Fold:
Amino acid sequence: MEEKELQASKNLVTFTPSKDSTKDSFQIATLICSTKLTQNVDLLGLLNWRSNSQNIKHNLKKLMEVDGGEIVKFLQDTLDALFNIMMEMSDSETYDFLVFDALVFIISLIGDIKFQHFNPVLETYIYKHFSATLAYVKLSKVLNFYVANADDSSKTELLFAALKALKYLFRFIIQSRVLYLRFYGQSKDGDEFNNSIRQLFLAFNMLMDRPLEEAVKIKGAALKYLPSIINDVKLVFDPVELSVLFCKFIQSIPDNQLVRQKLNCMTKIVESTLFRQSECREVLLPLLTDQLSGQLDDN
Structure:
């Protein structure tokens, strides 16, 4: 009623409530430990952005600060909402940035214990209900933009969080890619796609060449999470080229920094995709020897 008076204040349209709104009051606490009920303005705006084609900018801003418990109720539905949004409002690639940020928030949120069991749901989504075709193009686009623009402090933590999410980000990239491929039968531009891969990775290399102080944390985070993607790369790429990429990446490191970090990195590599051995073992190997032999005797 008070907010009615507020709208009645601006809209004096026969707004004279009866006094039977008397002095007496009551107080009630409402808790809802449900499984589908949801209380969030931003979330519902996401659910009728089709009728809120304006505040999508606004919502996007407000999304990353929404409670994850509310969100995980309809994570997949919101994923689809987002995907439709970015298919449709593909015009504002700035909105695509906001999308990128929000979805990073999503998956990072998922990384917490509270939500871990929902990981299958995500892939239950991914392989079964993901329905975006050129999304991966925009994804690689935004990502390479970001890695290029690493000099920003305000994008620095964003890059960090992205590094925290590489597996799933990459997997959605793959899914949009291959979705495009099949729904077009084949890939009229797979070349530039693998390029995008290469220049993205090159941007990583020049990060390694950048001052560590910017992202020492984040450069370690890189060497941590980068090898995660490689096994999905296998599905969509030449392992040999991937291999030489990661090699040159290793040289991209100045030789007195985060030793054990890079060690654990190459551990994560030899872990997997070394299995497709003969075309990758021989070429990854030498570098590993060179560094361990440096690691052998240095005092």
